[PDB]
Structure 1
Amino acid sequence: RVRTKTIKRAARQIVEKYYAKLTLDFQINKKITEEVAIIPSKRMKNKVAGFVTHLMKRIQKGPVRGI
């Protein structure tokens, strides 16, 4: 399924600005990203929000190369 450089760069751009707002819950991460970003495609917004969640669960247990 993977993803593209667009989603990778979007994930790198986000969180670095509003990390404290983002939590460990996938649904709340979706809701936060919904108003954090401005891209009007709901499907890839959901995709990138899931990307934010799966990147956030990589936090706090080792180096993550970013943020």
Structure 2
Amino acid sequence: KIRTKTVKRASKQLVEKYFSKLNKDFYQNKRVVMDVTIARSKKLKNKIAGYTTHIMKRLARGPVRGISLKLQEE
């Protein structure tokens, strides 16, 4: 259910440094996560993947609790 702070931390950092990740598709975001990361768990990588989707899907509204580098422009 509820995800840990390791998950959310790593995923926030990713969305700041990369806008290659931009998708609401689990599958794409998974494959780019895992190759860029060393975490050595299936669970953590799938969590992080799904979190990055969740971020972008919320950004469609506007407000998030995530971290992006978009602040520069704003």
TM-score when normalising by structure 2:
0.75
State the number of aligned residues.
66
Structure 2 unmatched runs, 5+: 69-74
CA distance in 2, matches of 1:56, 1:35: 20
Gaps of 5+ in 1: none
Taking structure 1 as the reference length, the TM-score comes to 0.81
User: Percent identity among equivalent residues?
Assistant: 52
What amino acid sits opposite 1:5 in the alignment? K
Q: Relative contact order, CA 8 A, sep 6+: which one is greater? A: 2
Match of 2:57 in 1: 57
Partner of 1:14: 14
Distance 1:58 1:36 in 2: 23
- Report which of the two has the higher share of helix: 2
Q: What root-mean-square deviation, in Å, do the aligned CA atoms of Structure 1 and Structure 2 show?
A: 1.4
Rg comparison, structure with higher value: 2
